[PDB]
Design a protein around this ligand. Sequence first.
Ligand SMILES: *[Se]c1ccccc1C(=O)NCc1ccc(OC)nc1
Ligand SMILES: *[Se]c1ccccc1C(=O)NCc1ccc(OC)nc1
Ligand SMILES: [Cl-]
Ligand SMILES: [Cl-]
Ligand SMILES: [Zn+2]
Ligand SMILES: [Zn+2]
Lengths: 153, 153
Amino acid sequence: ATKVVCVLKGDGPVQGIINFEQKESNGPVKVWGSIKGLTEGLHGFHVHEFGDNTAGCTSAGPHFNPLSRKHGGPKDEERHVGDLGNVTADKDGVADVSIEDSVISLSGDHCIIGRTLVVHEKADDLGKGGNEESTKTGNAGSRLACGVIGIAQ
Amino acid sequence: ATKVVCVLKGDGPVQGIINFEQKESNGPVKVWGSIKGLTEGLHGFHVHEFGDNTAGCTSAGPHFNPLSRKHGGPKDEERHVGDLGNVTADKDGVADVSIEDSVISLSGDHCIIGRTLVVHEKADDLGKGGNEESTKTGNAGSRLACGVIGIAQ
Ligand SMILES: *[Se]c1ccccc1C(=O)NCc1ccc(OC)nc1
Ligand SMILES: *[Se]c1ccccc1C(=O)NCc1ccc(OC)nc1
Ligand SMILES: [Cl-]
Ligand SMILES: [Cl-]
Ligand SMILES: [Zn+2]
Ligand SMILES: [Zn+2]
Protein backbone atom coordinates (compact mmCIF):
# COMPACT_ATOMS: atom_id res chain seq x y z
CA ALA A 1 0.00 0.00 0.00
CA THR A 2 2.97 2.39 0.49
CA LYS A 3 5.89 2.27 -1.94
CA VAL A 4 9.13 4.20 -1.54
CA VAL A 5 12.33 4.13 -3.54
CA CYS A 6 15.97 5.19 -3.33
CA VAL A 7 18.61 5.70 -6.00
CA LEU A 8 22.11 4.97 -4.65
CA LYS A 9 25.09 6.88 -6.14
CA GLY A 10 28.37 8.25 -4.76
CA ASP A 11 31.97 9.37 -5.41
CA GLY A 12 32.93 6.09 -7.13
CA PRO A 13 31.22 3.60 -9.54
CA VAL A 14 28.67 2.13 -7.14
CA GLN A 15 25.06 2.53 -8.24
CA GLY A 16 21.85 0.98 -7.16
CA ILE A 17 18.08 1.11 -7.11
CA ILE A 18 16.30 0.02 -3.95
CA ASN A 19 12.54 -0.38 -3.59
CA PHE A 20 10.59 -0.49 -0.33
CA GLU A 21 6.99 -1.69 -0.07
CA GLN A 22 4.67 -1.86 2.96
CA LYS A 23 1.16 -3.40 2.67
CA GLU A 24 -0.24 -1.99 5.94
CA SER A 25 1.20 0.56 8.36
CA ASN A 26 1.43 -2.17 10.98
CA GLY A 27 3.25 -4.46 8.62
CA PRO A 28 6.73 -5.59 7.51
CA VAL A 29 8.53 -3.70 4.79
CA LYS A 30 9.83 -5.63 1.81
CA VAL A 31 13.10 -4.24 0.42
CA TRP A 32 14.34 -5.27 -3.01
CA GLY A 33 16.52 -4.14 -5.82
CA SER A 34 20.09 -4.32 -7.06
CA ILE A 35 23.41 -2.59 -6.53
CA LYS A 36 26.38 -2.93 -8.89
CA GLY A 37 29.96 -1.74 -8.76
CA LEU A 38 30.65 -3.50 -5.41
CA THR A 39 33.57 -5.64 -4.24
CA GLU A 40 32.58 -9.26 -3.68
CA GLY A 41 31.34 -9.92 -0.15
CA LEU A 42 29.33 -8.16 2.53
CA HIS A 43 28.61 -4.42 2.49
CA GLY A 44 26.91 -2.72 5.39
CA PHE A 45 23.51 -1.35 4.53
CA HIS A 46 21.85 1.22 6.69
CA VAL A 47 19.29 3.97 6.85
CA HIS A 48 21.07 7.10 8.19
CA GLU A 49 19.29 9.85 10.07
CA PHE A 50 19.30 12.80 7.68
CA GLY A 51 18.18 12.99 4.07
CA ASP A 52 20.89 15.56 3.53
CA ASN A 53 23.31 14.94 0.65
CA THR A 54 24.72 18.51 0.61
CA ALA A 55 28.26 17.33 1.01
CA GLY A 56 27.75 13.78 -0.28
CA CYS A 57 27.03 10.75 1.93
CA THR A 58 28.77 12.29 4.95
CA SER A 59 25.94 14.78 5.54
CA ALA A 60 23.51 11.91 6.18
CA GLY A 61 24.82 11.71 9.73
CA PRO A 62 24.76 8.62 11.97
CA HIS A 63 22.49 5.58 11.68
CA PHE A 64 18.79 6.37 12.08
CA ASN A 65 18.26 5.66 15.75
CA PRO A 66 15.00 7.27 16.95
CA LEU A 67 14.89 4.97 20.03
CA SER A 68 18.45 5.71 21.25
CA ARG A 69 19.59 2.06 21.14
CA LYS A 70 22.97 0.49 20.32
CA HIS A 71 23.98 -0.85 16.89
CA GLY A 72 23.00 -4.38 15.97
CA GLY A 73 21.85 -6.61 13.16
CA PRO A 74 18.30 -6.55 11.77
CA LYS A 75 17.36 -9.70 13.65
CA ASP A 76 18.41 -8.22 17.01
CA GLU A 77 16.07 -6.51 19.49
CA GLU A 78 19.00 -4.26 20.32
CA ARG A 79 19.50 -2.37 17.06
CA HIS A 80 19.06 1.03 15.49
CA VAL A 81 15.92 1.38 13.39
CA GLY A 82 18.22 1.96 10.41
CA ASP A 83 20.26 -1.27 10.86
CA LEU A 84 19.49 -3.38 7.77
CA GLY A 85 22.57 -5.57 8.05
CA ASN A 86 24.62 -6.39 4.94
CA VAL A 87 23.99 -6.81 1.25
CA THR A 88 26.17 -9.38 -0.52
CA ALA A 89 27.88 -8.76 -3.84
CA ASP A 90 28.82 -11.70 -6.07
CA LYS A 91 32.08 -11.94 -8.02
CA ASP A 92 30.42 -9.83 -10.73
CA GLY A 93 30.09 -7.05 -8.15
CA VAL A 94 26.31 -7.24 -8.08
CA ALA A 95 24.21 -7.41 -4.92
CA ASP A 96 20.66 -8.55 -5.47
CA VAL A 97 18.87 -7.12 -2.48
CA SER A 98 16.04 -9.02 -0.85
CA ILE A 99 15.17 -8.06 2.72
CA GLU A 100 12.02 -8.13 4.83
CA ASP A 101 12.15 -5.97 7.95
CA SER A 102 9.55 -5.27 10.66
CA VAL A 103 11.37 -2.41 12.39
CA ILE A 104 11.72 0.19 9.64
CA SER A 105 8.39 1.60 8.46
CA LEU A 106 6.99 3.74 5.69
CA SER A 107 4.48 5.32 8.12
CA GLY A 108 3.99 5.82 11.86
CA ASP A 109 7.10 6.94 13.83
CA HIS A 110 9.99 4.79 12.57
CA CYS A 111 9.34 6.16 9.10
CA ILE A 112 12.39 6.18 6.80
CA ILE A 113 10.99 8.56 4.19
CA GLY A 114 13.24 11.58 3.66
CA ARG A 115 16.20 9.79 5.32
CA THR A 116 19.30 8.46 3.49
CA LEU A 117 20.06 4.85 2.56
CA VAL A 118 23.82 4.10 2.50
CA VAL A 119 25.82 1.11 1.25
CA HIS A 120 29.19 0.87 3.01
CA GLU A 121 32.76 -0.07 2.07
CA LYS A 122 33.08 -3.01 4.48
CA ALA A 123 30.94 -5.61 6.20
CA ASP A 124 28.84 -4.52 9.10
CA ASP A 125 29.91 -6.71 12.02
CA LEU A 126 26.34 -6.33 13.40
CA GLY A 127 27.68 -5.19 16.77
CA LYS A 128 29.94 -8.31 17.16
CA GLY A 129 33.34 -6.92 16.15
CA GLY A 130 34.89 -6.83 19.61
CA ASN A 131 35.52 -3.06 19.84
CA GLU A 132 33.67 0.07 20.90
CA GLU A 133 32.86 1.16 17.34
CA SER A 134 31.11 -2.19 16.75
CA THR A 135 28.17 -1.03 18.88
CA LYS A 136 27.91 2.35 17.07
CA THR A 137 28.66 1.84 13.38
CA GLY A 138 29.44 -1.87 13.12
CA ASN A 139 32.83 -0.97 11.57
CA ALA A 140 31.39 -0.90 8.07
CA GLY A 141 33.74 1.87 6.96
CA SER A 142 33.16 4.59 4.46
CA ARG A 143 30.02 5.36 2.48
CA LEU A 144 30.28 4.06 -1.08
CA ALA A 145 26.90 5.27 -2.31
CA CYS A 146 23.70 6.76 -0.95
CA GLY A 147 20.43 8.41 -1.82
CA VAL A 148 17.42 10.06 -0.16
CA ILE A 149 14.46 7.77 0.36
CA GLY A 150 11.44 9.09 -1.48
CA ILE A 151 7.73 8.47 -2.01
CA ALA A 152 6.91 6.33 -5.07
CA GLN A 153 3.72 5.83 -7.00
CA ALA B 1 11.87 24.31 14.00
CA THR B 2 11.89 21.70 11.24
CA LYS B 3 14.58 21.89 8.55
CA VAL B 4 14.68 20.05 5.25
CA VAL B 5 17.05 20.21 2.30
CA CYS B 6 17.24 19.28 -1.38
CA VAL B 7 20.27 18.87 -3.64
CA LEU B 8 19.29 19.56 -7.28
CA LYS B 9 21.20 17.72 -10.03
CA GLY B 10 20.43 16.63 -13.56
CA ASP B 11 21.78 15.62 -16.97
CA GLY B 12 23.25 19.04 -17.87
CA PRO B 13 24.97 21.93 -16.00
CA VAL B 14 22.12 22.82 -13.63
CA GLN B 15 22.85 22.21 -9.98
CA GLY B 16 21.64 23.71 -6.75
CA ILE B 17 21.10 23.43 -3.01
CA ILE B 18 17.75 24.45 -1.53
CA ASN B 19 16.94 24.71 2.14
CA PHE B 20 13.52 24.74 3.78
CA GLU B 21 12.71 25.80 7.33
CA GLN B 22 9.43 25.87 9.28
CA LYS B 23 9.40 27.46 12.76
CA GLU B 24 5.93 26.33 13.78
CA SER B 25 3.48 23.61 12.88
CA ASN B 26 1.26 24.95 10.11
CA GLY B 27 3.39 28.11 10.00
CA PRO B 28 5.04 29.49 6.80
CA VAL B 29 8.04 27.72 5.30
CA LYS B 30 11.10 29.73 4.31
CA VAL B 31 12.87 28.44 1.20
CA TRP B 32 16.37 29.63 0.35
CA GLY B 33 19.46 28.63 -1.54
CA SER B 34 21.09 28.93 -4.95
CA ILE B 35 20.99 27.29 -8.36
CA LYS B 36 23.58 27.71 -11.09
CA GLY B 37 23.99 26.74 -14.75
CA LEU B 38 20.65 28.28 -15.81
CA THR B 39 19.74 30.47 -18.77
CA GLU B 40 18.89 34.04 -17.77
CA GLY B 41 15.22 34.51 -16.87
CA LEU B 42 12.42 32.65 -15.13
CA HIS B 43 12.52 28.88 -14.48
CA GLY B 44 9.52 27.01 -13.12
CA PHE B 45 10.09 25.67 -9.66
CA HIS B 46 7.85 22.98 -8.29
CA VAL B 47 7.44 20.21 -5.78
CA HIS B 48 6.50 17.10 -7.81
CA GLU B 49 4.52 14.19 -6.34
CA PHE B 50 7.07 11.36 -6.21
CA GLY B 51 10.51 11.34 -4.62
CA ASP B 52 11.35 8.87 -7.37
CA ASN B 53 14.49 9.70 -9.28
CA THR B 54 15.05 6.19 -10.65
CA ALA B 55 14.96 7.43 -14.21
CA GLY B 56 16.13 11.00 -13.43
CA CYS B 57 13.64 13.84 -13.10
CA THR B 58 10.93 12.26 -15.28
CA SER B 59 10.09 9.65 -12.61
CA ALA B 60 8.99 12.45 -10.24
CA GLY B 61 5.56 12.55 -11.86
CA PRO B 62 3.19 15.58 -11.87
CA HIS B 63 3.06 18.50 -9.47
CA PHE B 64 2.33 17.57 -5.89
CA ASN B 65 -1.42 18.12 -5.69
CA PRO B 66 -2.92 16.44 -2.58
CA LEU B 67 -5.97 18.78 -2.73
CA SER B 68 -6.87 18.09 -6.41
CA ARG B 69 -6.72 21.75 -7.46
CA LYS B 70 -5.62 23.29 -10.77
CA HIS B 71 -2.16 24.77 -11.42
CA GLY B 72 -1.38 28.32 -10.32
CA GLY B 73 1.24 30.65 -8.86
CA PRO B 74 2.27 30.56 -5.20
CA LYS B 75 0.17 33.66 -4.48
CA ASP B 76 -3.01 32.10 -5.96
CA GLU B 77 -5.73 30.34 -3.94
CA GLU B 78 -6.17 27.98 -6.87
CA ARG B 79 -2.80 26.23 -6.99
CA HIS B 80 -1.25 22.86 -6.41
CA VAL B 81 0.54 22.47 -3.06
CA GLY B 82 3.76 22.10 -5.05
CA ASP B 83 3.40 25.32 -7.07
CA LEU B 84 6.33 27.50 -5.98
CA GLY B 85 6.29 29.69 -9.09
CA ASN B 86 9.61 30.64 -10.72
CA VAL B 87 13.19 31.23 -9.70
CA THR B 88 15.02 33.92 -11.65
CA ALA B 89 18.54 33.45 -12.98
CA ASP B 90 20.79 36.41 -13.75
CA LYS B 91 23.20 36.79 -16.66
CA ASP B 92 25.71 34.66 -14.75
CA GLY B 93 23.16 31.86 -14.81
CA VAL B 94 22.66 32.01 -11.04
CA ALA B 95 19.29 32.07 -9.26
CA ASP B 96 19.40 33.11 -5.63
CA VAL B 97 16.26 31.64 -4.13
CA SER B 98 14.36 33.37 -1.37
CA ILE B 99 10.72 32.34 -0.96
CA GLU B 100 8.29 32.22 1.93
CA ASP B 101 5.27 30.01 1.34
CA SER B 102 2.33 29.18 3.59
CA VAL B 103 0.85 26.32 1.59
CA ILE B 104 3.68 23.82 1.57
CA SER B 105 4.50 22.33 4.97
CA LEU B 106 7.15 20.17 6.60
CA SER B 107 4.48 18.19 8.49
CA GLY B 108 1.00 16.82 7.87
CA ASP B 109 -0.85 16.24 4.58
CA HIS B 110 0.80 19.27 2.93
CA CYS B 111 4.21 17.85 3.80
CA ILE B 112 6.80 17.92 1.00
CA ILE B 113 9.32 15.55 2.63
CA GLY B 114 10.15 12.61 0.39
CA ARG B 115 8.83 14.41 -2.71
CA THR B 116 10.99 15.88 -5.53
CA LEU B 117 11.90 19.54 -6.10
CA VAL B 118 12.30 20.33 -9.80
CA VAL B 119 13.76 23.32 -11.66
CA HIS B 120 12.42 23.65 -15.19
CA GLU B 121 13.70 24.73 -18.61
CA LYS B 122 11.20 27.57 -19.11
CA ALA B 123 9.05 30.00 -17.16
CA ASP B 124 5.96 28.78 -15.37
CA ASP B 125 3.16 30.96 -16.70
CA LEU B 126 1.42 30.47 -13.32
CA GLY B 127 -1.73 29.15 -15.00
CA LYS B 128 -2.25 32.38 -17.00
CA GLY B 129 -0.75 31.30 -20.33
CA GLY B 130 -4.08 30.78 -22.11
CA ASN B 131 -3.85 27.17 -23.18
CA GLU B 132 -4.96 23.93 -21.51
CA GLU B 133 -1.46 22.96 -20.33
CA SER B 134 -1.24 26.27 -18.44
CA THR B 135 -3.58 24.96 -15.71
CA LYS B 136 -1.74 21.62 -15.43
CA THR B 137 1.99 22.30 -15.74
CA GLY B 138 2.21 26.04 -16.43
CA ASN B 139 4.14 25.24 -19.62
CA ALA B 140 7.50 25.26 -17.86
CA GLY B 141 9.01 22.65 -20.14
CA SER B 142 11.61 20.06 -19.41
CA ARG B 143 13.16 19.20 -16.05
CA LEU B 144 16.70 20.52 -15.82
CA ALA B 145 17.59 19.36 -12.32
CA CYS B 146 15.87 17.78 -9.35
CA GLY B 147 16.38 16.11 -6.02
CA VAL B 148 14.44 14.33 -3.28
CA ILE B 149 13.47 16.54 -0.35
CA GLY B 150 15.09 15.15 2.78
CA ILE B 151 15.11 15.69 6.54
CA ALA B 152 17.94 17.92 7.77
CA GLN B 153 19.67 18.26 11.08
SE1 LIG C 1 6.21 8.58 6.96
C1 LIG C 1 5.25 9.05 8.09
C2 LIG C 1 5.71 9.34 9.36
C3 LIG C 1 4.80 9.79 10.33
C4 LIG C 1 3.44 9.95 10.03
C5 LIG C 1 2.95 9.69 8.76
C6 LIG C 1 3.81 9.26 7.74
C7 LIG C 1 3.31 8.98 6.34
O1 LIG C 1 3.61 7.92 5.80
N1 LIG C 1 2.57 9.90 5.71
C8 LIG C 1 3.04 10.62 4.53
C9 LIG C 1 2.93 9.81 3.24
C10 LIG C 1 3.86 8.81 2.94
C11 LIG C 1 3.74 8.07 1.77
C12 LIG C 1 2.70 8.34 0.87
O2 LIG C 1 2.62 7.61 -0.30
C13 LIG C 1 1.52 6.82 -0.74
N2 LIG C 1 1.82 9.33 1.17
C14 LIG C 1 1.90 10.04 2.32
SE1 LIG D 1 6.29 15.37 7.11
C1 LIG D 1 6.39 13.89 6.35
C2 LIG D 1 6.06 13.59 5.02
C3 LIG D 1 6.15 12.30 4.49
C4 LIG D 1 6.62 11.23 5.26
C5 LIG D 1 7.00 11.43 6.57
C6 LIG D 1 6.89 12.72 7.14
C7 LIG D 1 7.28 12.96 8.56
O1 LIG D 1 6.58 13.80 9.17
N1 LIG D 1 8.37 12.29 9.00
C8 LIG D 1 8.98 12.45 10.31
C9 LIG D 1 9.91 13.65 10.53
C10 LIG D 1 9.80 14.86 9.81
C11 LIG D 1 10.70 15.90 10.07
C12 LIG D 1 11.68 15.73 11.06
O2 LIG D 1 12.56 16.77 11.34
C13 LIG D 1 13.53 16.79 12.39
N2 LIG D 1 11.76 14.54 11.75
C14 LIG D 1 10.89 13.54 11.51
CL1 LIG E 1 28.57 5.06 9.50
CL1 LIG F 1 6.05 19.26 -15.38
ZN1 LIG G 1 23.38 1.02 13.50
ZN1 LIG H 1 1.23 23.02 -10.47
